[PDB]
Amino acid sequence: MTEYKLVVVGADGVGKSALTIQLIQNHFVDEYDPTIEDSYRKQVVIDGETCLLDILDTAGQEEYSAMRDQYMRTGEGFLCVFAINNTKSFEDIHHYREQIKRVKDSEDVPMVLVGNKCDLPSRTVDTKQAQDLARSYGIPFIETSAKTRQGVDDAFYTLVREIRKHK
Numbered sequence: 001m002t003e004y005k006l007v008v009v010g011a012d013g014v015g016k017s018a019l020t021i022q023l024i025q026n027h028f029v030d031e032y033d034p035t036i037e038d039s040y041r042k043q044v045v046i047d048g049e050t051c052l053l054d055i056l057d058t059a060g061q062e063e064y065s066a067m068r069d070q071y072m073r074t075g076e077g078f079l080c081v082f083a084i085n086n087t088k089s090f091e092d093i094h095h096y097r098e099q100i101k102r103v104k105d106s107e108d109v110p111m112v113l114v115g116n117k118c119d120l121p122s123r124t125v126d127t128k129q130a131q132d133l134a135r136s137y138g139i140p141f142i143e144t145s146a147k148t149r150q151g152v153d154d155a156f157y158t159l160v161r162e163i164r165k166h167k
């Protein structure tokens with residue numbers, strides 16, 4: 001069975017944990033319980049192939065930034081999440097991408113840019129600006145909501161497809 005090592009990264013509060021829990025458990029977490037580091041393993045069928053997804057749900061709190069080196073070395077693909085109502089979280093994407101590129105010594109690391117909380121009316125990052133950033137990196141971009149499940153399966157499955165091409 002093919003195993004995919006996915007790592008979910010992004011600023012504190014963007015919805016990394018809510019996206020992961022929505023994907024796996026099909027329910028939305030309203031509370032804000034900051035993460036240190038959680039991991040999940042789930043079997044799913046993607047494009048007719050039974051896949052084992054290893055999902056690492058990382059800390060957005062900068063206090064845990066020293067843990068990034070290990071997960072960036074081990075991870076095969078990265079879900080780079082910002083929230084569409086948090087401009088700082090969008091600005092922080094570039095830092096996560098440079099860090100990943102440095103650790104893996106490559107400009108071709110599987111990544112997907114995710115603009116989460118698309119159910120909210122309080123947008124501060126236009127879809128076009130995020131699509132332009134993703135085009136500059138050569139990676140896919142999808143908007144998601146951990147509350148409604150919009151784009152959630154597509155975001156994770158797209159990241160798996162980005163890893164799979166290299167095999």
Ligand SMILES: Nc1nc2c(ncn2[C@@H]2O[C@H](COP(=O)(O)OP(=O)(O)CP(=O)(O)O)[C@@H](O)[C@H]2O)c(=O)[nH]1
Nearest residue numbers: 012013014015016017018030034035060117145146
């Ligand atoms: N409306 C809405 N709220 C969301 C969405 N995703 C997460 N939230 C809310 O945002 C808050 C933070 O979500 P959480 O999943 O804990 O974020 P995180 O990025 O894991 C936080 P940390 O980096 O500290 O672990 C919570 O109140 C959660 O309900 C979403 O798509 N829509």
Ligand SMILES: [Mg+2]
Nearest residue numbers: 016017034035
């Ligand atoms: Mg979390």
